Amino acid sequence: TLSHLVDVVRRAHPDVDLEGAGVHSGQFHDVLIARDRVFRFPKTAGAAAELPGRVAVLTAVDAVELGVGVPVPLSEVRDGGPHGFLVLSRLHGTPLERGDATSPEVIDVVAAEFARVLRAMAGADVEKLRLVLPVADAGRWRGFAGRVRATLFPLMSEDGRARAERELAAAVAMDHVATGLVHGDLGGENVLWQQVEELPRLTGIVDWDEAKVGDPAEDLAAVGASYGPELVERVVALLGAGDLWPRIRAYQGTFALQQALAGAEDGDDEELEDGLTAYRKL
């Protein structure tokens, strides 16, 4: 009952307008959005464990000093509400539209905004991160391949399965890399910009759910998926990461199948359909 949660918040934080306040819901978490603050309320007592999990990931990422904002716990985890709640900062800024990011007058600025963040992520103390974050597992793509063949291959054309087998294989073939912080989903929607004296500034990165000690190529793949090779070539040039192109393409070739598999597993029909379109005719 969002009524109770509303009272929980007003009681704990009297001065926080919940009229015209966002709400995300799922069988796991309720989230009230406000001007400067996000309130997360777990639904089960097991899902309560997500709260210190989120605090631990965000604190470890903050400690790397990326030079851009990440969500900040604004409160201790509290055992108020049904199964606890956590107050996080709300970051300001908007994703860069593909059109905006690529203009000749801003493309170099955008490339360096991505580069300075990715550079800081690659320079993270991995021994510290490895204690808190998930660590890329050598069996990850093997296992992912298994679940795609079991769950999605039946829904595909023969041409679909051939294409999917090549894309799965390129990922399974990659040698294991765990050398820095990886966001794991660094598409445009999770990267927030403001016009600062009439040029873009990357001010925030949100949604660290897939954060891990892993392969820097995975974040470059995601930037490529959102903004195209013109931008990623400039980021790679700046980083001196020309070595990574095969790995970047291997990650990018799994993105439609990742979305399809999640659509099947999450029971989202539109994600399943959208993910599979290149892998069948009808």
Partner: peptide, 6 residues
């Protein structure tokens, strides 16, 4: 979700 990975 969504093509980037979600």
């Amino acid at each position: 979700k969504a093509x980037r990975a979600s």
